[PDB]
Swiss-Prot record, chain A:
GO CC terms, sorted: caveola; cytoplasm; cytoskeleton; cytosol; endocytic vesicle membrane; Golgi apparatus; Golgi membrane; nucleus
Keywords for this protein: Calcium, Calmodulin-binding, Cell membrane, Cytoplasm, Cytoskeleton, FAD, Flavoprotein, FMN, Golgi apparatus, Heme, Iron, Lipoprotein, Membrane, Metal-binding, Myristate, NADP, Oxidoreductase, Palmitate, Phosphoprotein, Zinc
Organism name: Homo sapiens (Human)
Biological processes annotated in GO: angiogenesis; aortic valve morphogenesis; arginine catabolic process; blood vessel diameter maintenance; blood vessel remodeling; calcium ion transport; cell redox homeostasis; endocardial cushion morphogenesis
Function recorded in the entry: Produces nitric oxide (NO) which is implicated in vascular smooth muscle relaxation through a cGMP-mediated signal transduction pathway. NO mediates vascular endothelial growth factor (VEGF)-induced angiogenesis in coronary vessels and promotes blood clotting through the activation of platelets.
Protein's name according to its UniProt entry: Nitric oxide synthase 3
Subunit structure: Homodimer. Interacts with NOSIP and NOSTRIN. Interacts with HSP90AB1. Forms a complex with ASL, ASS1 and SLC7A1; the complex regulates cell-autonomous L-arginine synthesis and citrulline recycling while channeling extracellular L-arginine to nitric oxide synthesis pathway.
Record localization: Cell membrane; Membrane, Caveola; Cytoplasm, Cytoskeleton; Golgi apparatus
Organismal lineage: Eukaryota, Metazoa, Chordata, Craniata, Vertebrata
Included stretch of the parent chain: 67 to 480 of 1203
From Swiss-Prot, chain B:
Organism: Homo sapiens (Human)
Top-rank taxon: Eukaryota
Annotated positions binding heme b: C104, Y395
Subcellular localization: Cell membrane; Membrane, Caveola; Cytoplasm, Cytoskeleton; Golgi apparatus
Annotated L-arginine binding sites: Q167, W276, Y277, E281, N286
Residues engaged in binding (6R)-L-erythro-5,6,7,8-tetrahydrobiopterin: S36, R285, A366, W367, F380
Parent sequence residues shown: 67 to 481 of 1203
Subunit-structure text: Homodimer. Interacts with NOSIP and NOSTRIN. Interacts with HSP90AB1. Forms a complex with ASL, ASS1 and SLC7A1; the complex regulates cell-autonomous L-arginine synthesis and citrulline recycling while channeling extracellular L-arginine to nitric oxide synthesis pathway.
The name this protein goes by in its record: Nitric oxide synthase 3
Sequence positions that bind Zn(2+): C28, C33
Renumbered residue ranges of the record's region Interaction with NOSIP: 32-401
Length: 400, 401
């Protein structure tokens, strides 16, 4: 009945009683595990549950106000086929959507999320204004603050609001003529689209891409992000003087803008959220991934390492220094940053907090474990249970 | 219908059609994934399936010989409740078991495995002779060779054969009087059990544990492995001259001996197998895990690193150097070893070969990806499907419980 979860490092044991209530169903079956894979009555049933979650959170479950709310939403659905949330409910939902994200190692700060109600957004122009205000509040001159901006929900009888970009700030990727790619190869598709929509492209490796904001039943409009608002950090190493001369850099604000927020059967196709970076995400993944910037060999060559064979561990050595550079650079530039050790350690605390709160915590082991030095972090030795709880952040198909 | 598996580095795509033939159920349900957790009529069915696999492997499927074999096993089971495997079947079975091990990144070598038939073993003393011969063959003076020794199967009318030790070679763990442990903390239980059974221990950090072998319905007997049979490697660093002075070492032969072998419904509780080490297992797991030798901090301090803050990545630096020392030490000592980069690269080839052969390959992502530099290896960016295929190696409860 209750999955036994053990920590092998310490030997501590707990039981996940929260998974037995997973609203949705995962891809795994008793026949095979696919955990490593990246990817009106029904509405009323999801709505009732959410409202119940809300009233339970303010210790008012079963009250008259609780019953009224349940009845009021059931009435809106019968009359309009859908319903609207109250400000306090959206705030509550958005927070839970983060708390329930299984692949996020930074959930310890879930409760201090700042939600911005942008359900009154009239068009692409206003949408752009909202995104700019979000970036300003979030960046905060380098002292990053977690936040999310919720745009008008999906509704029958019109299209939805959508931010074509995968993140508010992304570097362009130009298909160089010879097969190669200058800039970020992961952004090749979105870059070519920005160009198709009348954008004058650049020729650099770190060109900040414009935003392709789509309004309901309207073609995507192009908007350029004011340079003074997109904070960036020049990369340098504390002892490798030549590093700075590599011209590497990275933006300060990580902000996913292509995921769908779901709250009580309601879907918000546009709701950009952001926090702060964990060193590995930049130094190891974005900079060292073979299908990304792939700078590992270049740096190793500059470190004068024996790259003639794998046994020397030049890749491991190079990656470490690259990560050191990112941490050193971000701290020097007074920009919020967190190393994988501190991050994973805080997540272990989040697990303890959650076990006492709900009796479990949905977590995807594969994503919680950092890309480098896995077994060196406390989460590696921690067994985890993965399941889908609502509210939640979901992946959605590209608008094109 | 069939699970779509994708590689995010290259962009390639395949569909696991073999998972549909998974013989047994795992712990995951559509409600929640548990892949991160470490842990008569049916007999005939499993046996028939195995015989079909064997005859299909030698291109004799549906032949008189095949049909006769199936009849034999049915007759034997109906008469005794079990059956005798033919020599060639045991060989084929053991190989498949390795082939089907989801948590093994070294399966590219599944076909090259020496098999010792010890089904004639009648005592612990004899069980010891078999083991020593295995170690000698497998060790091969440094040029390690994959091998397995299959002891008498589980049957009605008597107890099972067991090897209480989790590996043929492991270091003792002595609980000091201050909460600390001298030696391998992971071996405190097995160490104490050997002592309780009459063995007077040493007091070092690297004491090879005596073998606790058990014959059917008999108490375990102590057996000391001859030092000349246990090949060890002294650890040193190519540049860090002070590393050698740490007096650290490790054995050459990794040999699991607490697992059960399952072939066509038959269970072999004692079937020790071995291969060779992948550097990270020793450098990262055995020496750096906080619950093992935990030398990470001492090494960092010796490296004169700044252990004050975590942002300096002192842990990461020390781990890399400890791994380099293991690779350097084994290469110098002429003892077979492979780094995580070469091992993972070879496993990517295994996936391809298996995609052509059986149309898929069960793999536990969490175990395949090395304990360090995960994203730097080719397997990290590869989707995998985990499931149970027989023949297979299975975990089993400790004989003293
Ligand atoms: C406090 C700073 C935060 C840190 C350090 C952090 C870190 C991470 C990391 C490391 C991942 C995995 C990314 C990858 O390897 O691809 C992730 C995923 C995720 N995080 Fe957080 N996060 C933070 C804040 C937030 C906030 C404010 C939200 C939402 C309100 C959030 C929502 C998510 C979601 C939905 C995912 C899945 C994204 C995906 O798989 O594409 N995170 N986060
Ligand atoms: C040829 C050299 C070999 C290498 C480098 C290799 C490497 C590995 C590694 C790294 C693990 C995971 C250990 C851990 O993380 O705790 C593993 C597990 C395993 N290997 Fe291989 N292996 C080899 C040979 C073999 C052979 C010869 C067999 C069987 C005939 C085998 C059967 C298995 C099984 C069943 C497991 C799972 C063990 C467990 O769950 O505790 N391996 N191997
Ligand atoms: O390292 C990080 N921090 C992050 C914050 C968000 Cl919202 C998403 C991904 C992240 O990866
Ligand atoms: O690194 C390794 N090599 C191994 C060989 C066997 Cl048989 C088991 C575990 C191993 O871990
Ligand atoms: Zn699963």
């Amino acid at each position: 009945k209750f999955p036994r979860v053990k920590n092998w490092e310490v030997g501590s044991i707990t039981y996940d009683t929260l998974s037995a209530q997973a609203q949705q169903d995962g891809p795994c079956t008793p026949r095979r595990c696919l955990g490593s894979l990246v990817f009106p009555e029904q509405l009323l049933s999801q709505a009732r549950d959410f409202i119940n979650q809300y009233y339970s959170s303010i210790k008012r479950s079963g009250s008259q106000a609780h019953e009224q709310r349940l009845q009021e939403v059931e009435a809106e659905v019968a009359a309009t086929g859908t319903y609207q949330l109250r400000e306090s409910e959206l705030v509550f939902g958005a927070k839970q959507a983060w708390r329930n994200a299984p692949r996020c190692v930074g959930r310890i700060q879930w409760g201090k999320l700042q939600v911005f109600d942008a359900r009154d957004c009239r068009s692409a122009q206003e949408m752009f204004t909202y995104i700019c205000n979000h970036i300003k509040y979030a960046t905060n001159r380098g002292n990053l603050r977690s936040a999310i901006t919720v745009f008008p929900q999906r509704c029958p009888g019109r299209g939805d609001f959508r931010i074509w970009n995968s993140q508010l700030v992304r570097y362009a990727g130009y298909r160089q003529q010879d097969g190669s790619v200058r800039g970020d190869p992961a952004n090749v598709e979105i870059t070519e689209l920005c160009i198709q929509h009348g954008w004058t492209p650049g020729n650099g490796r770190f060109d900040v891409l414009p935003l392709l904001l789509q309004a309901p039943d309207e073609p995507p409009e192009l908007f350029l992000l004011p340079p003074e608002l997109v904070l960036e950090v020049p990369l340098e190493h504390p002892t490798l003087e030549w590093f700075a001369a590599l011209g590497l850099r990275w933006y300060a604000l990580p902000a996913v803008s292509n995921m769908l927020l779901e709250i009580g059967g309601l879907e918000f196709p546009a709701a950009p959220f952001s926090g702060w970076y964990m060193s590995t995400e930049i130094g190891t993944r974005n900079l060292c991934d073979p299908h990304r910037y792939n700078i590992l060999e270049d740096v190793a060559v500059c470190m004068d390492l024996d790259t003639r064979t794998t046994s020397s561990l030049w890749k491991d050595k190079a990656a470490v220094e690259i990560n050191v550079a990112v941490l050193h650079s971000y701290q020097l530039a007074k920009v919020t940053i967190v190393d994988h050790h501190a991050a994973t350690a805080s997540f272990m605390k989040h697990l303890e907090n959650e076990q006492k709160a709900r009796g479990g915590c949905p977590a995807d082991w594969a994503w919680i474990v950092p890309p480098i030095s896995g077994s060196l972090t406390p989460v590696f030795h921690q067994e985890m249970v993965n399941y889908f709880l609502s509210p939640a952040f979901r992946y959605q198909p590209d608008p094109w």
